[PDB]
Structure formats: C-alpha cells, structure tokens
Swiss-Prot record:
Phenotype for residue 53 to S: In CFHD; with membranoproliferative glomerulonephritis
Post-translational modification as stated in the protein's UniProt record: Sulfated on tyrosine residues.
Function: Glycoprotein that plays an essential role in maintaining a well-balanced immune response by modulating complement activation. Acts as a soluble inhibitor of complement, where its binding to self markers such as glycan structures prevents complement activation and amplification on cell surfaces. Accelerates the decay of the complement alternative pathway (AP) C3 convertase C3bBb, thus preventing local formation of more C3b, the central player of the complement amplification loop. As a cofactor of the serine protease factor I, CFH also regulates proteolytic degradation of already-deposited C3b. (Microbial infection) In the mosquito midgut, binds to the surface of parasite P.falciparum gametocytes and protects the parasite from alternative complement pathway-mediated elimination.
Disease: Basal laminar drusen: Drusen are extracellular deposits that accumulate below the retinal pigment epithelium on Bruch membrane. Basal laminar drusen refers to an early adult-onset drusen phenotype that shows a pattern of uniform small, slightly raised yellow subretinal nodules randomly scattered in the macula. In later stages, these drusen often become more numerous, with clustered groups of drusen scattered throughout the retina. In time these small basal laminar drusen may expand and ultimately lead to a serous pigment epithelial detachment of the macula that may result in vision loss.
Domain Sushi positions: 8-66, 69-126
Cysteine disulfide links: 10-53, 39-64, 71-113, 99-124
Protein name: Complement factor H
Lineage, highest ranks first: Eukaryota, Metazoa, Chordata, Craniata, Vertebrata
Domain note: Sushi 1-3 domain represents the minimal unit capable of cofactor activity. The property to discriminate self surfaces from non-self surfaces depends on the C-terminal region made of Sushis 19-20.
Subunit record text: Homodimer. Also forms homooligomers. Interacts with complement protein C3b; this interaction inhibits complement activation. Interacts with complement protein C3d. Interacts with CR3/ITGAM; this interaction mediates adhesion of neutrophils to pathogens leading to pathogen clearance. Interacts with complement factor I.
Subcellular location: Secreted
Residues glycosylated per entry: 98
Domain of life: Eukaryota
Tissues and organs where the protein is expressed, per its UniProt entry: Expressed in the retinal pigment epithelium (at protein level). CFH is one of the most abundant complement components in blood where the liver is the major source of CFH protein in vivo. in addition, CFH is secreted by additional cell types including monocytes, fibroblasts, or endothelial cells.
C-alpha cells in the first residue's frame, strides 16, 4: 500500500560514517526498503544500524565509535590454532581458527572479539 509512499526512487544504499553495509546492492530499493549496516572491526555500532529508503532519501544512518578495547590475543583451542592474527584485536574484529592435522573443525572457523572474549571457537575432533 502507499503507507507514506510518494515513492520517488533510490538505488544503492549510502555509506556508513566509519562502518559500512553488509547487504549487497539490489539498486531497485525504491521505497520503505531497509538496509543493515555494521561497524569497522575496531569500531562499534552506536546507531540503529538499519535504515530505510523514504521517498526522497534514506533515514538516519548509524554511527560507529571506537570502543578502544582489546581481546588480548588469540585464545587456545584444545586441538586448534589460528591462521591470521591482527593485533591489537579490537572489539568487532575477527580471527580465523584452524584445527590441527588429523582433527576436523566443528563450528565456525572465525570468531569475533566480543567484550574481551572471542565468540565461541570451533572444536577440533579426532578424525
């Protein structure tokens, strides 16, 4: 329906100040379309992180602020370790873990620095 639809036309979503959008460009948004943004791996989301294409422009874009916090380093996995490491590991940053030879990883290969602790890590089991 025409909820507030004057419905001009809008293509790809704008850019977040520091962060960015995770959803890919459809270009055919047009009206009342919502887009989700994320912040940098060293900036946290302060804003509503989602926007809508109103008939004229998008809504209030989010804000990204540096938490200025670190997770320390890469943790230990019972039979796993890591591929990449980028210190300082700020909140919002990611790491890929790798399980040793003869072990298979179960879970997410990657983790995210969350409040000084990474997400969850996968588990490496004896193949």
């Amino acid at each position: 329906e025409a909820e507030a639809a004057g419905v001009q036309s809008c293509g790809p979503p704008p850019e977040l100040l520091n962060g960015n959008v995770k959803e890919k460009t459809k270009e055919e948004y047009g009206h009342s379309e919502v887009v989700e943004y994320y912040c940098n791996p060293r900036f946290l989301m302060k804003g509503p992180n989602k926007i809508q294409c109103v008939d004229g422009e998008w809504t209030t874009l989010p804000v990204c602020i540096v938490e200025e916090s670190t997770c320390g380093d890469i943790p230990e996995l019972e039979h796993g370790w890591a591929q990449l490491s980028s210190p300082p590991y700020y909140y919002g940053d990611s790491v890929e873990f790798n399980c040793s030879e003869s072990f298979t990883m179960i879970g997410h290969r990657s983790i995210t620095c969350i409040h000084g602790v990474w997400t969850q890590l996968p588990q490496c089991v004896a193949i």
